[PDB]
Write a protein that holds these residues in place. Structure first.
Motif, mmCIF file in Angstrom:
data_model
loop_
_atom_site.group_PDB
_atom_site.id
_atom_site.type_symbol
_atom_site.label_atom_id
_atom_site.label_comp_id
_atom_site.label_asym_id
_atom_site.label_seq_id
_atom_site.Cartn_x
_atom_site.Cartn_y
_atom_site.Cartn_z
ATOM 1 N N UNK A 139 -1.540 1.334 -3.799
ATOM 2 C CA UNK A 139 -1.979 0.375 -4.797
ATOM 3 C C UNK A 139 -1.075 -0.441 -5.486
ATOM 4 N N UNK A 143 -6.289 -1.779 -4.471
ATOM 5 C CA UNK A 143 -5.940 -0.931 -3.388
ATOM 6 C C UNK A 143 -5.587 -1.811 -2.191
ATOM 7 N N UNK A 147 -3.532 4.878 2.093
ATOM 8 C CA UNK A 147 -3.990 4.209 0.936
ATOM 9 C C UNK A 147 -2.912 4.291 -0.348
ATOM 10 N N UNK A 198 -5.962 7.137 -10.988
ATOM 11 C CA UNK A 198 -4.491 6.678 -10.101
ATOM 12 C C UNK A 198 -3.268 6.939 -10.929
ATOM 13 N N UNK A 199 -2.019 7.539 -10.304
ATOM 14 C CA UNK A 199 -0.890 7.563 -11.191
ATOM 15 C C UNK A 199 0.295 7.194 -10.279
ATOM 16 N N UNK A 255 -0.391 8.250 -6.458
ATOM 17 C CA UNK A 255 -1.277 9.276 -6.361
ATOM 18 C C UNK A 255 -2.672 8.666 -6.794
ATOM 19 N N UNK A 256 -3.574 8.743 -5.818
ATOM 20 C CA UNK A 256 -5.121 8.333 -6.087
ATOM 21 C C UNK A 256 -6.272 9.541 -5.867
ATOM 22 N N UNK A 266 -3.563 -2.027 -10.025
ATOM 23 C CA UNK A 266 -4.167 -0.777 -9.676
ATOM 24 C C UNK A 266 -5.176 -1.072 -8.597
ATOM 25 N N UNK A 302 -4.164 5.327 -14.747
ATOM 26 C CA UNK A 302 -5.275 4.626 -14.700
ATOM 27 C C UNK A 302 -6.437 5.605 -14.379
#
Lengths: 100, 277, 10
Positions: free
Chosen positions: A57, A63, A55, B97-98, B10-11, A61, B118
């Motif tokens: 993005x 995905x 995953x 998220x970053x 990163x998530x 933002x 975010x």
């Protein structure tokens, strides 16, 4: 918050030639939140050995993921990708067209 | 190949019903993924995804694992703090998220750095281009900004984004030169598809290219045309290269008026395709 | 190489 529905492309890695091994791809992008279910189908039945990318993005933002599997196209077999996401009321099926 | 970048993504997604957030980290050089961490994987280590990073030794992988686990714990804390800054139920899942990284120019010297964060898919806080100040999107993020100014976060990131990030990007470009410094120009061809006796579709294909940045444009008699055209989003082939096509609908018999123009880092001059068949 | 040692919380 914002829910963004996935864009879906279904395509082969290499130009499709009947009887020659290849890879079938289902690229889902532009979606949020990240939980999504993606299956690849052969004559409507779920294919078992399907792999997917890690995953990540985009700049907005949203995905993206690639699902894929080895396959051997033929003149008769139909392939597709089936996607479900919180934004869809029922799973969405996009058929593979070898010219797209 | 020209300018380059290193970027980390990163998530974290909270799991209100049971357990800790799901956490996924990925690193890229240009458009090449080279490392992953996934909290749902068995190793609980930073893992290699490209051949040229497998030669880093155990101190590397231990350091990377330590740091990426610390990122995951920060995001866990932040999910909790943000549910509170926003007054949200404990029942719902939410996302942090970053993304951060650096760009270098063709000279492999620092060009720009970035750090963006975010919450639930919208901008929260981001480092400005000077690497000294922050952009906060709302009043929750404005409280974060004041805390990060007092803690001198931007000074520490700036030193990473100008220093470490560039230095290790350059090491990767060198070590991965067989692929990372190779551009793969698009392999191009046109197809034709008769809709009726009077109109046809011409499709211009670009296959097996790297990096992903590409421009496909149609011209009629030498002037750009966007009417009666269609362009798909660039998509990965799955072998590290990319694909794209563009199409135009034309009066059958007039195909020769139309030209596809393909621009890519791997092409010293743009290519022009025409249905001459 | 990732940023370290430990990113500050929000």
């Amino acid at each position: 918050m914002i829910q963004r529905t996935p864009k879906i492309q279904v395509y082969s890695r290499h130009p499709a030639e009947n009887g020659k091994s290849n890879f079938l791809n289902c690229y889902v992008s532009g979606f949020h939140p990240s939980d999504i279910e993606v299956d690849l189908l052969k004559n409507g039945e779920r294919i078992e050995k399907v792999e997917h990318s890690d995953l990540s993005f985009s700049k907005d933002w949203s995905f993206y993921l690639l699902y894929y599997t080895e396959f051997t196209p033929t003149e008769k077999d139909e392939y597709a990708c089936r996607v479900n996401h919180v934004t869809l009321s029922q799973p969405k099926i996009v058929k593979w067209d070898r010219d797209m | 190949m020209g300018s380059h970048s290193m970027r980390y993504f990163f998530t974290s997604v909270s799991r209100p019903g049971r357990g800790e957030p799901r956490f996924i980290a990925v690193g890229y050089v240009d458009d090449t993924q080279f490392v992953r961490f996934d909290s749902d994987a068995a190793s609980q280590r930073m893992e290699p995804r490209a051949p040229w990073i497998e030669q880093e030794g155990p101190e590397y992988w231990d350091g990377e694992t330590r740091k990426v686990k610390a990122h995951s714990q920060t995001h866990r804390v932040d999910l909790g703090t943000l549910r509170g800054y926003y007054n949200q139920s404990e029942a719902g899942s939410h996302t942090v998220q970053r993304m951060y990284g650096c760009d270098v120019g063709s000279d492999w010297r620092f060009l720009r750095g970035y750090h963006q964060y975010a919450y639930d898919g919208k901008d929260y806080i981001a480092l400005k281009e000077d690497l000294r100040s922050w952009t906060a999107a709302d009043m929750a993020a404005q409280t974060t900004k004041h805390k990060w100014e007092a803690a001198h976060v931007a000074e520490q990131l700036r030193a990473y984004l100008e220093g470490t990030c560039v230095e290790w990007l350059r090491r990767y470009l060198e070590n991965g030169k067989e692929t990372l410094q190779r551009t793969d120009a698009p392999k191009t061809h046109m197809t034709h598809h008769a809709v009726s006796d009077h109109e046809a579709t011409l499709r211009c294909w670009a296959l097996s290219f790297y990096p992903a940045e590409i421009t496909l444009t149609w011209q009629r008699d030498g002037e750009d045309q966007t009417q009666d055209t269609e362009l798909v989003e660039t998509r990965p082939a799955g072998d590290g290269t990319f694909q794209k096509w563009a199409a135009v609908v034309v009066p059958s018999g007039q195909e020769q008026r139309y030209t596809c123009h393909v621009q890519h880092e791997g092409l010293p001059k743009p290519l022009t395709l025409r249905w001459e068949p | 190489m990732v940023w370290g040692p430990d990113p500050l919380y929000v």
